[PDB]
Design a binder for this molecule. Structure first.
Ligand code: PIO
Lengths: 436, 10, 81, 276, 119, 96
């Protein structure tokens, strides 16, 4: 640099000095000599140097250029982005991305793959695209530098964490997977800390941010991305739990005693008799109370218990070749269940079928309808007995569904959660015991 | 009012 | 073998399941089953401010995380030099 | 015309400060516990130095806490744009009050009126209030300095009983950037008895004052701080600069300089409190 | 267990009108149609297809029972992880206060203590 | 101490390169002791050295052979019974 400057051959030209410093990664000299208060700077002047710094992985120079009057939004044009993705994107990373897309397909992974294909073959969120490019190549410092400029900081961190985790699930190269995993953990920590701090500052703005869906960042919000990544750490934070509790209790004050609500549920007039002090007229109190998700859940469990009692009564005491009125009421209730199931099937049908318990419930409904068909054949006693067997199967599977409901209560929810894993391990142990 | 006040000032 | 399974805390898993159940029961017609039948028949027939606040809190977070280097005795050595 | 994309008003240089203050107090703004003026300087490009950012962030936070008036040039190019952006960010997060005073002639685009100004000089839209001086119409040289100094002096002459500060409302000049205009503003403030705080370690004239805080030493410091500026400046310019340096340094107690070594938290607040 | 017993009773006996008898039987059979006893086996409409049903029922009940037991013990290790010394000391304070702020007389002789106290 | 040194050296080297690291691991010296690194680690019951990610990856590659390690196991199991699926696009082989 001293030879280039003191030579006076190119002393007047500053771009050469800047490029020379960038190539050798001399940050301090760049901040001192080339960049000074007297000198005037423009974004068009920096464009090429910024691009070169991005290519050569010079995060500190990128930060310096951003500080000194560089507009990253204007710089990231479609042509620049497509050129960067097409050429300066390593083939190994593209192969890993293809492997992930095929073997481990995910809602966000297909989105990022489509974006990458669009930019590789030929501008809603250029910053997000650049951040994704940095992340896929496991550039820690450059990724953080870009993240400091994004608007959806916590959302971007969660998306990066999920993408890096699903990329590390690959096994083509261990080193890249480990780097991706550690970077994902770091971004998860960043998101958790940022949201904590922000939730401590304000509560309503934090909740609005949490539920907010970006302008098609990935088609999902912070909560959904955290859930898809199984980020238990992020959801377990006090702010998220408080948000969920407020959603669960609705307008009902969260601090009111549960026994008061339970007692008032049976006794309607107590709703507007001074109990259950609502967070926000008697009619308004009643509508708010009955619109509460907690009250709806309690009503649903009571109704399910009554339905199970009626089903057991039908099977144990009133079973005949011709249906009776209690059997007709049972048919009406199961039809209500079926139409509720259809309504829930309209939304998240893929998730509706994927869920193990959901598939179990659908199988139970199919079993019940099959048993109805069998029982309709009053001509043959064998058909009636088969229908009775199918009804017993329906009863047991309905009890399993009832068991699912109990998970809400903190008292016996963790018990069931543990019971599932213990059941799996015990099944394996019993298989070995069975063999010998 | 505001416009009249501004005109009066200048 | 079971002691190892119970070693892991189930509180986080329960909170996760709680989120799932809350979402299931919230994004749903808040009517009891006896009265929900008619609900289906009836059914068949700002951001900039939040993002700016997020950026402000990000600035505060970045300052807090970068202050860690302050505790180092390098500054005192530089003043001494 | 009201710029929308606040309130922008064109006022003649020969305007009594009393009328403007009465107007602002009657129905526009409340009594100001504090008032700080920043002299960015002629340079339209502000270097986002590692320390300057935190200093001005603390300054704006203090102004919001005290409900102070922040006076600047209002130009969209340079430090003023950064201050306006920070004010907007704080508003997004008691209202901050920013006044940008400039010369109508130097403005590139002039819109007359509720006409809206949408993008020769450019003014930041972040500033909530703007004033355009017009005496040398279509005149390149700056003429808003006289009106700014007169307004600051009048506000100093004011008296607020509510404020803890005895009698007159506190006023603090600020100097982070170098330039002839900055030095002239510092001279006027010192002659006005209003203290100024100079950010040592950044800027040419600011660092020169910090080092000074004789004539040959002043010239050497001025040359070292701004080699290009001193080389372009003529000998008469250097003599005038040394004269202003000697004039301002005649009252050292008023001016306060932030130590380069001092880089901890609440340094800006400490310096301002010490100066007051 | 009772759900399983209801399913079994429904499939075995039909239209049992004795409400007391059926109410007791539904609860009572599944527990004793298992490791406890084998009345169902003696009772045991094709049999060649009936035997696998009872076999699978017994297998399911046994696996569920063992899973329950093991899960309960695992849950218990967490309860015992917390030290009970502090809780015992707390209870000790309670008992000491109860026995100290009290007429220090044995029960056989405490009867006259109340009469003396009233007067 | 020497076990720690060996583990760290092999980790670092396996991080730098993968194929050279595996070649070194399987390499038998000019009769150093008549054995390679893996055999000596096994004889010493150096579970710590073998548990490292590089050794496990090497063992997995050896176990799956030419079959890609990332392919789903259920695909392989299903195709085992059904011969024609072997060259029907499933089990994308790592390497007619
Ligand atoms: C017989 C078959 C089954 C019978 C039904 C058996 C059903 C059953 O067993 O659920 C018990 C359940 C227990 O409620 P549960 O104690 O877990 O409620 C939470 C608990 O109190 C926590 O302690 C609280 O946190 P913290 O202490 O502050 O830290 C938390 O508040 P928050 O932190 O979230 O704000 C509470 O939400 O009670 C019901 O309301 C369910 C309605 C059931 C209606 C029953 C109608 C008969």
């Amino acid at each position: 640099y001293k030879a280039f400057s003191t030579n006076e051959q190119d002393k007047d030209n500053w771009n050469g000095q800047l490029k020379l410093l960038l190539e050798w990664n001399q940050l301090d000299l760049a901040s001192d000599e080339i960049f000074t208060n007297d000198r005037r700077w423009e974004s068009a002047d920096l464009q090429e140097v910024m691009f070169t710094a991005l290519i050569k992985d010079r995060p500190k120079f990128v930060r310096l250029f951003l500080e000194n009057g560089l507009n990253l939004q204007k710089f990231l044009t479609n042509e620049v982005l497509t050129e960067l993705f097409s050429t300066h994107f390593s083939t190994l990373v593209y192969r890993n991305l293809q492997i992930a897309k095929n073997s481990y397909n995910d809602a966000l992974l297909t989105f990022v793959w489509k974006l990458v294909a669009n930019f590789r073959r030929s501008t809603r969120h250029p910053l997000q695209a650049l951040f994704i490019w940095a992340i896929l190549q496991n550039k820690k410092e450059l990724s953080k530098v870009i993240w400091e400029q994004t608007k959806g900081c916590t959302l971007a961190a969660l998306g990066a964490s999920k993408l890096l985790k699903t990329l590390a699930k690959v096994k083509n190269d261990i080193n890249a997977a480990g780097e991706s995993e550690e970077l994902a953990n770091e971004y998860e920590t960043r998101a958790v800390e940022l949201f904590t701090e922000c939730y401590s500052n304000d509560e309503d703005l934090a909740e609005q941010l949490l539920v907010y869906s970006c302008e098609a960042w990935g088609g999902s919000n912070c909560l959904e991305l955290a859930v898809e990544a199984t980020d238990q750490h992020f959801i377990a934070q006090p702010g998220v739990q408080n948000f969920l509790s407020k959603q669960w209790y609705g307008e009902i004050s969260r601090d009111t005693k549960n026994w008061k609500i339970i007692l008032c549920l049976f006794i309607i007039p107590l709703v507007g008799c001074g109990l259950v002090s609502f967070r926000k007229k008697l009619l308004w109190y009643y509508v708010a109370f009955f619109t509460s998700p907690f009250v709806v859940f309690s009503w649903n469990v009571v109704f399910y218990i009554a339905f199970l009692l009626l089903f057991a009564y039908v099977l144990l005491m009133d079973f005949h070749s011709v249906p009776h009125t209690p059997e007709l009421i049972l048919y009406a209730l199961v039809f209500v269940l079926f139409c509720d199931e259809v309504r829930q099937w309209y939304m998240n049908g893929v998730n509706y079928f994927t869920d193990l318990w959901n598939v179990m419930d659908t199988l139970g409904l199919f079993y019940f309808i099959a048993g109805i068909v069998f029982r309709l054949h009053s001509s043959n006693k064998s058909s009636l007995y088969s229908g009775r067997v199918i009804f017993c199967l329906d009863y047991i599977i309905f009890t399993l569904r009832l068991i699912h409901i109990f998970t809400v209560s903190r008292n016996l929810g963790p018990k069931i959660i543990m019971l599932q894993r213990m059941l799996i391990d015990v099944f394996f142990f019993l298989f070995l015991f069975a063999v010998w | 009012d505001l416009v009249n006040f501004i005109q009066a000032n200048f | 073998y079971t002691v190892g399974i119970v070693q892991e805390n189930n509180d986080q898993v329960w909170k996760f399941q709680r989120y799932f159940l809350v979402q299931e029961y919230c994004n749903r017609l808040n009517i009891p089953f006896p009265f929900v039948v008619f609900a289906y028949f009836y059914m068949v027939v700002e951001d900039n401010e939040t993002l700016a606040w997020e950026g402000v809190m990000k600035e505060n977070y970045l300052v807090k995380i970068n202050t860690k280097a302050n505790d180092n005795s390098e500054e005192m050595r530089h003043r001494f030099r | 015309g009201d710029i929308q994309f606040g309130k922008y008003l064109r006022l003649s240089c020969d305007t009594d400060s009393e009328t403007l203050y009465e107007l602002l107090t009657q129905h526009w703004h409340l009594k100001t516990p504090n008032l700080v003026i920043s002299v960015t300087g002629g340079a339209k490009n502000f270097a986002l130095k590692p320390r300057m950012r935190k200093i001005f962030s603390r300054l704006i936070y203090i102004a919001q806490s005290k409900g102070a008036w922040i006076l600047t040039g209002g130009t969209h190019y340079g430090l003023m744009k950064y201050i306006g952006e920070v004010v907007r960010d704080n508003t997004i997060s008691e209202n901050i009050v920013a006044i940008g005073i400039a010369a109508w002639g130097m403005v590139s685009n002039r819109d007359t009126l509720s006409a809206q100004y949408i993008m020769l000089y450019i003014l930041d839209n972040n500033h909530t209030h703007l004033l355009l001086v017009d005496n040398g119409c279509h005149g390149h040289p700056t003429v808003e300095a006289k009106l700014r100094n007169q307004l600051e002096k009048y506000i100093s002459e004011r008296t607020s009983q509510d404020s803890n500060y005895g009698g007159k409302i506190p006023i603090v000049c600020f100097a982070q950037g170098g330039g002839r205009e900055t030095l002239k503003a510092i001279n006027t403030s010192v002659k006005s008895k209003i203290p100024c705080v100079v950010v040592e370690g950044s800027g040419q004239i600011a660092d020169v004052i910090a080092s000074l805080v004789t004539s040959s030493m002043v010239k050497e410091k001025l040359v070292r701080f701004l080699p290009r500026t001193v080389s372009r400046l003529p000998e008469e310019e250097i003599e005038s600069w040394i004269k202003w340096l000697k004039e301002i340094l005649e009252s050292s107690h008023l001016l306060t300089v932030i130590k380069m070594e001092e880089a901890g938290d609440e340094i800006v607040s400490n310096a301002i409190s010490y100066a007051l | 267990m009772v759900a399983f017993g209801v399913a079994r009773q429904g499939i075995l006996r039909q239209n049992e009108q004795r409400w007391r008898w059926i109410f007791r039987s539904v609860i009572y059979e599944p527990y004793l149609a298992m490791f406890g006893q084998v009345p169902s086996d003696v009772d045991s409409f094709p049999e060649w297809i009936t035997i696998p049903l009872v076999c699978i029922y017994m297998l399911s009940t046994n696996i569920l029972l063992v899973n329950l037991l093991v899960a309960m013990f695992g849950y218990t290790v967490g309860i015992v992880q917390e030290n009970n010394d502090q809780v015992w000391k707390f209870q000790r304070y309670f008992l000491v206060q109860e026995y100290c702020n009290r007429l220090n007389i044995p029960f056989p002789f405490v009867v006259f203590a109340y009469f003396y106290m009233v007067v």
